[PDB]
Paper text:
PARS1 is one of the aminoacyl‐tRNA synthetases (ARSs), which mediate the covalent ligation of amino acids to their cognate tRNAs for protein synthesis (Kim et al, 2011; Kwon et al, 2019). PARS1 catalyzes the covalent linkage of proline to tRNAPro. Unlike the other ARSs, PARS1 exists as a part of the bifunctional enzyme, glutamyl‐prolyl‐tRNA synthetase 1 (EPRS1), which comprises glutamyl‐tRNA synthetase 1 (EARS1), three repeats of WHEP domain, and PARS1 (Kwon et al, 2019). PARS1 is a homodimer formed by the PARS1 protomers A and B (Zhou et al, 2013).
DWN12088 and DWN11251 bound to PARS1 protomers asymmetrically (compounds with asymmetric binding, ABC), whereas HF, DWN11748, and DWN11761 bound symmetrically (compounds with symmetric binding, SBC). More specifically, protomers A and B of SBC‐bound PARS1 and protomer A of ABC‐bound PARS1 showed similar structures to each other, whereas protomer B of ABC‐bound PARS1 was different from the others in terms of the binding of both ATP and the compounds. The electron density map of ATP in protomer B of the DWN11251‐bound structure was also unclear compared with the others. Protomer B of the DWN11251‐bound structure also showed the decreased number of hydrogen bonds compared with protomer A. When comparing the number of hydrogen bonds of protomers A and B with each compound, relatively similar numbers of hydrogen bonds were counted in the complexes with SBC. In contrast, protomer A made over 10 more hydrogen bonds than protomer B in the complexes with ABC, implying the flexible or weakened binding of ATP in PARS1 protomer B. Another ABC, DWN11251, had a ketone group in the bridge, unlike DWN12088, and the halogen substituent of the bicyclic ring in HF was changed to a halogenated benzyl group, making the structure bulkier. In protomer A, halogen atoms in HF and DWN12088 showed an optimal distance to H1093 of 3.36–4.26 Å, and the distance between H1093 and the fluoride group in DWN11251 was 3.22 Å. On the other hand, since the distance was very close (2.2 Å) in DWN11251‐bound protomer B, the R‐loop was not stabilized due to the van der Waals repulsion or steric hindrance with halogen atom, possibly resulting in the unstable binding of DWN11251 to the R‐loop in protomer B. Overall, the flexibility of the A‐loop and R‐loop in the PARS1‐compound complex structures seemed to be responsible for the different binding modes between ABC and SBC. ABC showed relatively wide margins and gentle slopes while SBC showed narrow margins and steep slopes.
Residue numbers in the entry:
A (entry chain B): 1016 to 1310, 1318 to 1462, 1475 to 1489, 1500 to 1512
B (entry chain A): 1016 to 1309, 1314 to 1463, 1475 to 1497, 1500 to 1512
């Protein structure tokens, strides 16, 4: 790794994702291969999130990727602005299809026709379905791995309820899991908030979000989304049930939808990565500890490495013994640091017979000598501390880089020196357009649930910044 | 359920998959919704296979679904008949794309250009990658849920090796896992074999396969596929390395690919399904035991529900997947039939009389037998009944395949045996021209299923084909 983050972030990012073996490029613009190292992080997030929404009663399923042409039109599910992003299939082989067929950019138009046929009474509610799947958005915006890709993997949850109280409660439960994914799995702090009228999903009532800060850019990014849809889609698609008390009266279902993507992995990369490459938070590292031998008799050195064995596996630590004879120790050192392995355990002959080893933390660079039989306890303590270290530096960097302005003067003074700032806000769109072009430019990120301090007149303190 | 499996198979199948809540229909022909009841089975297969290939050193990844026109134009990875099955993206919104992009029907052309860049020396091998992903094949044959769908879910594994002996061993380990998915998870027996030259993947060296039999059809089906590709694809795609100890000879990697799909769930439905609905093998049933509570007081009623919720915890604690149906708006008789249609292996009936007699009742979905159990043996005995349901389901389907797969040595007995809804092992040339002949002669058709590794009888000392001498016993039959 030779590019440096603070000077050229784009090229640093591209060289970390490649030299960590996370991403391989493809010959289609905005499409990336997720190699096992990148995919294992996604799998870990999936394991966590899946387990959580299962306690909420959500069930997994799989809906078609193709949407019929007339099911896309149906109503103002999308105002035509979102239409350029939709890829259309028009032939199989050379045979032009009777009607063109669309590639899921989201699955409302595929799912809700089915909800309307499953809901024949209030006993059929709630419906709570989730799917892990790929989606295609023909993004015009300049493409980057995991940040802005043309195909990505995600989960989209879609739930329908008899009452507003239930739907409204889920929206905030899901948003909290998203925050837990980022803050507890990925050691990235986030700001919960609600979208302004400009930035909310046109198809919903309100849109909640979690926002993250990437210092080296000075830019924020939407990490996850949870919408209350009210009855916007229920009336559109006729998901209706009989009023239990009033004969002949249909009442429309209340709906939510929520989504999280592999953009998580890029954000973790942009947040924790350093000038030596990736840095993996322990709770998602598929290798938390790598064993590397340093320095015939030698077979005793490999038996000692392989005695860390289960001694680490038996304490349920993900461990890799890199015993390959074909690479130098120094090669292994740099190879696993580029991949972001939280702890390097080096065994040298000196230490086999002094019944010691050395551990090197990927965040601090600290090298530490441990008694041979203190491996289990102290290694666990280091991996827990690395996690807390990584979340603490990212917390204290968001504290530093998120401040207040009450004037356009100091908001602008502060925006352009790499800052995101909460400002009092009209709340109206054309004002938001106006702030967008003056500072060029800043978007609205979210109206925080717990803003700075207590507050056309200002309706809300709203967090502003340049954003992906 | 209204249709009967024996009389009209399609409508019975259509009504089992829907009224069990496995499938919802879509407005695109050959595309189907996988509702939780069916998707949970896929997740169970996924969990097993994933563990197994992890021991073989295979790692999971995700490659793009889009294939460039120009990457598809470089190599010849497929014969010309497969080109129609490819769906093309030709515009975004209203803007026609400069070059069209194809939807993955399989991922050789997407992956192997990357393999070529990752492989620069012998220490870069082996490469062992797997992906769970969706695939589109614009099928001409008649589409049926989970049997033959235009979009499906699958796993495709692609591995690259330095030596031929490594590749050759993976092919059959993988195949044996497929047969394990079928025989141990779904209680379906299968026939391992090699495809004839006609039916093998044209661009590889040889194709191994497992075939399953659907009695009610008299039809067999390809349940899984494992290819040895030799070096046909390493030469096309230039996956080469130099060995320092073999100076001056270019080493092309030895490759395999293998695939298994949600056709699994369709086969399970056809094999074990009955005229009361789905029949779930305990090992993939996402609910193995359903607890149903079956006037006097409201405090008493809460105690009945507390006992059901105490059976649920005792059963989770012995790792039995359990759902307590505590919905108050349905009768017990209703819940009884609803969970039978869904194929739940065991119904647990708890009533007030059994609560104070410290008993419960279990009824098996495979035989229907009702059993009163002491409250204390719930964990031990319920576990035993699920293990016996599994063994029963696999035993009956085995005893149905032995019955329905026989040997014939004349085209004349081959025809009569075929026409009684059976699959036939016949002595066979192996040549393509002949295979077309059997196909239409038996229509006035039967195709080859596989060449069994362990055929019923040993062939030859110069035994002649059913035409040219016989090379091998070949398993022939009508097929999905
Ligand atoms: N092209 C993309 N690649 C990866 N992740 C994405 C992409 N577009 C959106 N996401 C993520 O998926 C989630 C789904 O939200 P959605 O796409 O509806 O919001 P959006 O307002 O279009 O977002 P954005 O400004 O990121 O395009 C978002 O929270 C975001 O983090
Ligand atoms: N349209 C489909 N829907 C579901 N599963 C399929 C479909 N086509 C193939 N499969 C399954 O995918 C596996 C691997 O795919 P492969 O290309 O080897 O099949 P195939 O030879 O084309 O199959 P088939 O003879 O059924 O057309 C097969 O073992 C089969 O079980
Ligand atoms: O995905 C969501 C909201 C929510 N869905 C459920 C998961 C969470 C997500 O936030 C809207 N959306 C975002 N980016 C889009 C691009 C195109 C279209 C589009 C274009 C034409 C027709 C059509 F039906 C949809 C929708 C898009
Ligand atoms: O899928 C396999 C082999 C194996 N892959 C690895 C997983 C297991 C599978 O058996 C060949 N094949 C079968 N059905 C096809 C339809 C179209 C094309 C095709 C591909 C590219 C371009 C094109 F025009 C057509 C290949 C197909
Ligand atoms: Mg977008
Ligand atoms: Mg936006
Ligand atoms: Mg085929
Ligand atoms: Mg075939
Ligand atoms: Zn204003
Ligand atoms: Zn012959």
């Amino acid at each position: 790794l030779e590019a440096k983050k603070e000077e050229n972030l784009a090229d640093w990012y591209s060289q970390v994702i490649t030299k960590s073996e996370m991403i391989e490029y493809h010959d289609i613009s905005g499409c990336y291969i997720l190699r096992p190292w990148a995919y294992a992080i996604w799998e870990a997030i999936k394991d966590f999130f899946d387990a959580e929404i299962k306690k909420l009663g959500v069930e997994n399923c799989y809906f078609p990727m193709f949407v019929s042409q007339s099911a896309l039109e149906k109503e103002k599910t999308h105002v035509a602005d979102f239409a350029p992003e939709v890829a259309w299939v028009t032939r199989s082989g050379k045979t032009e299809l009777a009607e063109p067929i669309a590639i899921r950019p989201t699955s409302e138009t595929v799912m809700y026709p089915a909800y309307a046929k499953w809901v024949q009474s209030h006993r059929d509610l709630p419906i709570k379905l989730n799917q892990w799947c790929n989606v295609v958005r023909w993004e015009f915006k300049h493409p980057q791995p995991f940040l802005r890709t043309r195909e990505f993997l995600w989960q989209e949850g879609h739930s329908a309820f008899a009452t507003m109280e239930e739907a409204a409660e889920e929206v905030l439960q899901i948003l909290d899991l998203y925050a837990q994914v980022y803050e507890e799995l990925l050691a990235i702090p986030v700001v919960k908030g609600r979208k302004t009228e400009k930035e909310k999903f046109a198809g919903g009532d309100y849109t909640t979000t979690i926002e993250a800060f990437i210092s080296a850019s000075g830019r924020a990014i939407q990490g996850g989304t949870s919408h209350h849809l009210g009855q916007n889609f229920s009336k559109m698609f006729e998901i209706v049930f009989e009023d239990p008390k009033i004969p002949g009266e249909k009442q429309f279902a209340y709906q939510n939808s929520w989504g999280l993507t592999t953009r998580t992995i890029g954000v973790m990369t942009m947040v924790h990565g350093d000038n030596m490459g990736l840095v993996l938070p322990p709770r998602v590292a598929c290798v938390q500890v790598v064993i590397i031998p340093c320095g015939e008799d030698k077979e005793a050195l490999i038996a000692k490495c392989n005695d860390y064995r289960r001694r680490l596996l038996s304490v349920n630590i993900r461990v890799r013994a890199d015993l390959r004879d074909n690479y130098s120790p120094g090669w292994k050192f740099n190879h696993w640091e580029l991949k972001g392995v939280p702890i390097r355990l080096e065994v040298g002959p000196r230490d086999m017979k002094s019944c010691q080893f050395v551990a090197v933390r990927r965040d601090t660079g600290e090298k530490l000598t441990v008694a041979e039989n203190e491996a289990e306890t102290k290694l666990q303590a280091i991996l827990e501390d690395i996690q807390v270290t990584l979340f603490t530096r990212a917390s204290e960097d968001l504290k530093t880089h998120m401040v207040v302005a009450n004037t356009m003067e100091d908001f602008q003074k502060i925006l352009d020196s790499g800052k995101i700032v909460q400002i009092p806000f009209c709340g109206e769109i054309d004002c938001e357009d106006w702030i967008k072009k003056t500072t060029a430019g800043a978007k609205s990120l979210c109206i925080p649930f717990k803003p700075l301090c207590e507050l056309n007149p200002a309706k809300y303190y709203t967090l502003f910044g340049r954003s992906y």
